Amino acid sequence: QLIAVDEKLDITTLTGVPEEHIKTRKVRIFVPARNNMQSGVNNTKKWKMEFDTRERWENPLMG
């Protein structure tokens, strides 16, 4: 009633992400630093995972 299969979990084929947004992106796992403009620490309690910055350009119309 249980397979008891022993393998590293990988659902990368079931989420529908394009292939070049999986093997090319580099995620950062970190606790965000406290904003030095303020003395509060409530924004440094959890962990954040984010993606690497890619190119941003200027729209020819309206800039």
Binding site: E58, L61, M62, G63
Partner: protein, 144 residues
């Protein structure tokens, strides 16, 4: 009865300045009603009211035949009404701009404009900011 309504129709014909005015108003506005003149506009529009008509038909405007640059005997639109008569006509207020006029400012347009889409004076958007990064300019002198 019938006689009274035909007499009222005859008075409607008479009150538009004769047969020529009757035909002009009938072919320009598809309406031949007569009401008390409330206001005259600096562009030529005329504004009439009739409080015995039901709400929405108690106020109307006969548009001018010539706005800023175009003939307007046939091609009329609602964007021609100046803002004060726009307020009075849409029943946002009970007072025409004649009894009490709007406050006068030095930046308010003295010349209203209609919708200028489809015309050379239409609006074209652009980015109103300056260039963020400036490039290096090489010297004009030779290096060797």
């Amino acid at each position: 009865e019938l006689v009274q309504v035909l007499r009222r129709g005859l008075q409607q014909v008479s009150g538009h300045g004769g047969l020529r005015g009757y035909l002009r108003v009938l072919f320009r506005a598809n309406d031949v009603r007569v009401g008390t003149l409330v206001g005259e506009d600096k562009y030529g529009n005329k504004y009439y009211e009739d409080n015995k008509q039901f709400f929405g038909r108690h106020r109307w405007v006969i548009y001018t035949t010539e706005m800023n640059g175009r003939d307007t005997f046939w091609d009329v639109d609602g964007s021609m009404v100046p803002p004060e008569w726009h307020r009075w006509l849409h029943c946002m207020t009970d007072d025409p701009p004649t009894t009490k006029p709007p406050t006068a400012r030095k930046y308010i347009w003295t010349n209203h404009k209609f919708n200028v889409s489809g015309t050379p004076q239409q609006y074209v958007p652009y980015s109103t900011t300056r260039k963020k990064i400036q490039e290096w300019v090489p010297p004009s002198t030779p290096y060797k």
